[PDB]
Design a protein around this ligand. Structure first.
Ligand code: GW9
Ligand code: GW9
Length: 270
């Protein structure tokens, strides 16, 4: 591995830690309970939910949702998390050598289709077999509780849990995930791209640094890179299935509005 590539990776790594407050290392120390005797508040039923919701009683009232069904409240708070992560990814993309120089429309297109593939990828970092950290690591909503919600809301997170478990089995660190997320955004296959040639050249570089980094960082996992390539395909499919379930929810649930920023992303996605 050369020096220009070795720096390009650290640069990507740098932008990852600067723009994402909840990295895998922060989460893994919380979940282990080895650096603090004060665990996060656990949400496992409607009771503990209403207790945690009393913390954000201000924004629930502002958004006129404080009185709606419990499933819809979670669906609304989670949209906020997506908006934040989409924003953070928009800033993270600037550190991708060549992304800032692409035409503006192609930047919107790359993010329009990649953000949710990146979200579900990074979402694995805050997940275990029993639940996921929430509110910057101050809460832990249980997997079973999300399954107990009424359909179709109970079908939202479970596939993400299933993906995170298999994804976490690869035992990647933020060093690897950062490059992995960069490759997800720099995909020359996105419908609507104008300068496909430039983006593809930009992707070949990212994917190259990733393949070398994986060999350097995980030498005893010979086919870790092929495994990831298959993980990109699984994420793409996972997002498709997710977008299908959202359109089913937005139409057959007149009570669960859709955030304006996310409406654009989901609009004419596939
Ligand atoms: C963001 C943070 C917290 C809450 N909450 O707890 O009520 C809600 C939101 C939010 O963005 N709600 C929303 C959903 C859809 C359209 C506009 C606003
Ligand atoms: C919903 C979507 C994404 C995340 N996240 O990635 O941190 C979290 C949530 C969520 O359920 N947040 C929450 C916090 C407190 C009480 C209810 C729900």
């Amino acid at each position: 591995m050369t020096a220009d590539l070795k720096s390009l990776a650290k640069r990507i790594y740098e932008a990852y830690l600067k723009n994402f407050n909840m990295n895998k290392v922060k989460a893994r120390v919380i979940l282990s309970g080895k650096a603090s005797n004060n665990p996060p508040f656990v949400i496992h039923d409607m009771e503990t939910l209403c207790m945690a919701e009393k913390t954000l009683v201000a924004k629930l009232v502002a958004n006129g949702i404080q009185n709606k069904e419990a499933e819809v409240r979670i669906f609304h708070c989670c949209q906020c998390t997506s908006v934040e992560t989409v924003t953070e990814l928009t800033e993270f993309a600037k550190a991708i050598p060549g992304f800032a120089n692409l035409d503006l429309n192609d930047q919107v297109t790359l993010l329009k289709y990649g953000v949710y593939e990146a979200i579900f990828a990074m979402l694995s970092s805050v997940m275990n077999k029993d639940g996921m950290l929430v509110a910057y690591g101050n809460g832990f909503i249980t997997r079973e509780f999300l399954k107990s919600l009424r359909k179709p809301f109970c079908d939202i997170m479970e596939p993400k849990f299933d993906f995170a478990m298999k994804f976490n089995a690869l035992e990647l660190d933020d060093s690897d995930i950062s490059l992995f997320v960069a490759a997800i955004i720099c995909c020359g296959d996105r419908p609507g791209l104008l300068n496909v040639g430039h983006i593809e050249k930009m992707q070949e570089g990212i994917v190259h640094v990733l393949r070398l980094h994986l060999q350097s960082n995980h030498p005893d996992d010979i086919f870790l890179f092929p495994k990831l390539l298959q993980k990109m395909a699984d994420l793409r499919q996972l997002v498709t299935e997710h977008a299908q379930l959202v359109q089913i929810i937005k139409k057959t649930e007149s009570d669960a509005a859709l955030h304006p920023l996310l409406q654009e992303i989901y609009r004419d996605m596939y």
